[PDB]
Amino acid sequence: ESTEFEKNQKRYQDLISTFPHEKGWRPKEPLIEYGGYWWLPSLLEGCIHAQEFFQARPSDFLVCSYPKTGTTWLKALTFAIANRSRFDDSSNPLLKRNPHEFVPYIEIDFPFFPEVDVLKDKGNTLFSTHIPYELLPDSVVKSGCKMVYIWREPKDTFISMWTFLHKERTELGPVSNLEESFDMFCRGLSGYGPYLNHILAYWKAYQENPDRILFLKYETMRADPLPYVKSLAEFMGHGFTAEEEEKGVVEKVVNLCSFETLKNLEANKGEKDREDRPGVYANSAYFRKGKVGDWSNYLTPEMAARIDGLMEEKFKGTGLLE
Numbered sequence: 001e002s003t004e005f006e007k008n009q010k011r012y013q014d015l016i017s018t019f020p021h022e023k024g025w026r027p028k029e030p031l032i033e034y035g036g037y038w039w040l041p042s043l044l045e046g047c048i049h050a051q052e053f054f055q056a057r058p059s060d061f062l063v064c065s066y067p068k069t070g071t072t073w074l075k076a077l078t079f080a081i082a083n084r085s086r087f088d089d090s091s092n093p094l095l096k097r098n099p100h101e102f103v104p105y106i107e108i109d110f111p112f113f114p115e116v117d118v119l120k121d122k123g124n125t126l127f128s129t130h131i132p133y134e135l136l137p138d139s140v141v142k143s144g145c146k147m148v149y150i151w152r153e154p155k156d157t158f159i160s161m162w163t164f165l166h167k168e169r170t171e172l173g174p175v176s177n178l179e180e181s182f183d184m185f186c187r188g189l190s191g192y193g194p195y196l197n198h199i200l201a202y203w204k205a206y207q208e209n210p211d212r213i214l215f216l217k218y219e220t221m222r223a224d225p226l227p228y229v230k231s232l233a234e235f236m237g238h239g240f241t242a243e244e245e246e247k248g249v250v251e252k253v254v255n256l257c258s259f260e261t262l263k264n265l266e267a268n269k270g271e272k273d274r275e276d277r278p279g280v281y282a283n284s285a286y287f288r289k290g291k292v293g294d295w296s297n298y299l300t301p302e303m304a305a306r307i308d309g310l311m312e313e314k315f316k317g318t319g320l321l322e
């Protein structure tokens with residue numbers, strides 16, 4: 001009657017209890033270092049579990065991101081693309097439920113909510129994670145399963161994250177202030193951080209096996225979504241036919257999965273939350289503003305310049321700026 005996670009939880013807690021701990025973004029919530037990256041304690045226990053128990057298949061398809069870079073969007077797009085033969089846009093399930101219900105996290109749903117329907121359906125091939133490339137379950141890497149990675153301009157990412165954290169259901173305390181939070185982010189003391197190292201390891205992975213990994217960028221998709229959605233569909237093995245294109249199927253998929261559509265659904269309003277298992281966020285927390293450039297409403301020019309420089313120092317000559 002205990003799940004596999006529950007049977008192993010005490011040993012996971014013992015294990016991580018001696019990993020280095022640093023002050024985090026809430027007073028009762030330290031960050032814990034594993035594999036050169038920093039973690040929330042729960043998410044680290046999930047990651048350890050995934051590492052020990054998750055069994056990927058070659059036909060699986062993994063959505064990979066650092067948080068707040070476009071994960072919910074990609075979840076909607078991937079689900080919509082793979083299932084479009086089943087559903088008209090007007091009766092698609094993404095109209096009634098938050099996209100996170102359709103694409104389970106290997107470090108959150110797998111360990112903590114293994115009884116969700118999607119995880120019992122061997123017909124499901126869609127999964128997500130924020131686990132850094134270097135720390136992925138050995139099964140994932142060995143299966144050869146295809147991956148899509150998304151990243152985002154770091155100022156907007158930080159602001160997406162800092163605002164979002166105000167909305168968490170938690171008794172571990174309020175989030176640190178803007179300046180302390182940003183300092184921590186810049187030092188790489190963030191969940192799944194350092195952000196810039198997260199990106200670079202997947203980017204290296206891509207360069208080594210560009211057939212296996214599709215690298216996407218929030219701002220690029222946001223400004224010109226059609227080519228990238230077609231690219232994604234093709235990479236998934238669900239490319240759009242000439243017939244679908246001329247009947248405007250691609251636009252229908254883009255519209256369904258758009259910020260404006262998703263934000264304005266009853267399912268995603270107010271305090272409404274997921275129906276499959278307990279969330280610590282309301283669905284609405286996932287849709288804030290959906291813009292490029294919102295950092296300028298929050299960060300000083302001095303803060304902006306610090307992170308821009310950090311990015312240009314880390315990525316110069318990698319191809320990521322170029």
Ligand SMILES: Nc1ncnc2c1ncn2[C@@H]1O[C@H](COP(=O)(O)O)[C@@H](OP(=O)(O)O)[C@H]1O
Binds near residue numbers: 066286
């Ligand atoms: N369908 C969509 N299209 C574009 N952006 C979306 C989106 N759904 C959510 N977002 C935005 O993507 C960010 C969340 O990323 P994640 O899904 O990785 O947690 C938030 O950015 P903002 O906080 O800038 O509004 C959110 O509003």
